[PDB]
Design an enzyme around this catalytic site. Structure first.
Site, PDB file in Angstrom:
ATOM      1  N   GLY A   1      13.800 -14.145   6.020  1.00  0.00           N
ATOM      2  CA  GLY A   1      12.393 -14.111   6.951  1.00  0.00           C
ATOM      3  C   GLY A   1      10.962 -13.881   5.421  1.00  0.00           C
ATOM      4  N   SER A   2      10.237 -12.913   5.580  1.00  0.00           N
ATOM      5  CA  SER A   2       8.673 -13.192   4.937  1.00  0.00           C
ATOM      6  C   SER A   2       8.229 -11.988   6.242  1.00  0.00           C
ATOM      7  CB  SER A   2       8.495 -13.966   4.531  1.00  0.00           C
ATOM      8  OG  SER A   2       8.564 -14.521   5.704  1.00  0.00           O
ATOM      9  N   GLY A   3       7.643 -10.681   5.065  1.00  0.00           N
ATOM     10  CA  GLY A   3       7.179  -9.748   5.837  1.00  0.00           C
ATOM     11  C   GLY A   3       5.919  -9.368   5.332  1.00  0.00           C
ATOM     12  N   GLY A   4       4.559  -8.491   5.747  1.00  0.00           N
ATOM     13  CA  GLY A   4       3.535  -8.426   4.873  1.00  0.00           C
ATOM     14  C   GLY A   4       3.312  -6.234   4.745  1.00  0.00           C
TER      15      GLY A   4
ATOM     16  N   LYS B   1       8.967  -6.143   3.558  1.00  0.00           N
ATOM     17  CA  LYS B   1      10.395  -6.737   2.952  1.00  0.00           C
ATOM     18  C   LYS B   1      11.990  -6.779   2.355  1.00  0.00           C
ATOM     19  CE  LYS B   1       8.091  -7.205  -0.841  1.00  0.00           C
ATOM     20  NZ  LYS B   1       7.984  -8.309  -2.345  1.00  0.00           N
ATOM     21  N   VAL B   2      12.506  -7.228   3.616  1.00  0.00           N
ATOM     22  CA  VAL B   2      13.727  -7.525   3.297  1.00  0.00           C
ATOM     23  C   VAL B   2      14.220  -8.488   2.487  1.00  0.00           C
ATOM     24  CG1 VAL B   2      16.400  -6.468   4.858  1.00  0.00           C
ATOM     25  CG2 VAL B   2      13.944  -6.840   5.615  1.00  0.00           C
TER      26      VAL B   2
ATOM     27  N   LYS C   1      15.755  -3.305   1.835  1.00  0.00           N
ATOM     28  CA  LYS C   1      14.142  -3.138   2.441  1.00  0.00           C
ATOM     29  C   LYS C   1      13.152  -2.276   2.226  1.00  0.00           C
ATOM     30  CE  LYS C   1      12.053  -1.505   7.291  1.00  0.00           C
ATOM     31  NZ  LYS C   1      12.483  -1.178   8.780  1.00  0.00           N
TER      32      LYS C   1
ATOM     33  N   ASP D   1      11.433  -0.679  23.544  1.00  0.00           N
ATOM     34  CA  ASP D   1      10.884  -2.731  23.012  1.00  0.00           C
ATOM     35  C   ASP D   1      12.332  -3.188  22.911  1.00  0.00           C
ATOM     36  OD1 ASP D   1       8.636  -3.213  22.413  1.00  0.00           O
ATOM     37  OD2 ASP D   1       9.185  -3.250  20.756  1.00  0.00           O
TER      38      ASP D   1
END
Ligand SMILES: Nc1ncnc2c1ncn2[C@@H]1O[C@H](COP(=O)(O)OP(=O)(O)OP(=O)(O)O)[C@@H](O)[C@H]1O
Length: 255
Positions: free
Chosen positions: A17-20, A23-24, A38, A132
């Site tokens: 993916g690409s988190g902010g 990040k994984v 992670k 959720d």
């Protein structure tokens, strides 16, 4: 480049993916064994956030030895500046896999449904209601679904297709998770979530809480499956089927 976690060098194959700020990374240890790391930056995290991050790390670490349908957390490193979590590495999340597939092997659908129940059952047994749940919360690992989070993480394009009616009317118990699991199965059965057709979000939420908006259950070969969907998607939580009940349901038991 590399990541050291508890004095162990891991090399980064790629970012998943690409988190902010989170990040994984797909990584390899010295012996070329594959893991997922992670990374979380804590420099902008308040105490309540930190508290919930620790709480999820606590429960993930704890519930591991009870079910192999929870993602394996091998080790972690946690300071004031950052977190590293060394984890079991999965192929693909359920949502990404569903998005690129018109149909699904009926046997595989059933098998995945078993995994999901086992995972959600396990967290319920230790007092955790996820609240959720959506297909992205599950990861395929050697043809098994594993729950990768418990929804405890706080203020870290949404979706409300999986939301139970009682959360909306209330403006939440183990039954809330049953509804969402019900929407995930419905999706794997009929290729769309129950209220997916309603593009207007305000309407959608009204559709979810409205008794007179009856959910369609097109006839299918597996009449047991059809029954499971009807039971999970009953608006009254009291009338809705529990997880232990779902574990005894013919759909999951009868070969
Ligand atoms: N243990 C794991 N094994 C394999 N893949 C994982 C694991 N944990 C997370 N992932 C994947 O890493 C990706 C992370 O993407 P990203 O950092 O953009 O966050 P996101 O999950 O897409 O959304 P958000 O970051 O807002 O929660 C996800 O697609 C997820 O499926």
């Amino acid at each position: 480049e590399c990541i050291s976690v508890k004095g162990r060098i891991y090399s980064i194959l790629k970012q998943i993916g690409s988190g902010g700020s989170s990040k994984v990374f797909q990584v390899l240890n010295e012996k070329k064994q594959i893991y997922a790391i992670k990374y979380v930056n804590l420099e902008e995290a308040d105490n309540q956030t930190l508290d919930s991050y620790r709480n999820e790390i606590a429960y993930l670490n704890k519930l591991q030895q009870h079910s192999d349908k929870i993602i394996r957390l091998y080790d972690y490193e946690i300071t004031d500046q950052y977190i590293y979590m060394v984890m079991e590495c999965g192929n693909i999340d359920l949502n990404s896999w569903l998005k690129k597939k018109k149909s699904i092997d009926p046997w595989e659908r059933k098998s995945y449904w078993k995994n999901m129940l086992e995972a959600v059952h396990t967290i319920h047994q230790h007092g955790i209601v996820h609240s959720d749940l959506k297909p992205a919360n599950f990861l395929i690992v050697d043809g098994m679904l594993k729950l990768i989070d418990f929804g405890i993480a706080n203020q870290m394009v949404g979706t409300v297709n999986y939301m139970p009616p009682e959360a909306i009317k209330d403006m939440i118990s183990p039954k809330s998770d049953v509804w969402s699991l019900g929407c995930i199965l419905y999706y794997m059965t009929y290729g769309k979530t129950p209220f997916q057709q309603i593009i207007n979000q305000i309407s959608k939420l009204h559709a979810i809480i409205d008794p007179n908006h009856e959910i369609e259950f097109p006839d299918i070969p597996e009449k047991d499956l059809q029954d499971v969907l009807k039971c999970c998607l009953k608006r009254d939580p009291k009338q809705r089927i529990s997880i232990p009940e779902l574990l005894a349901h013919p759909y999951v038991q009868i070969q």
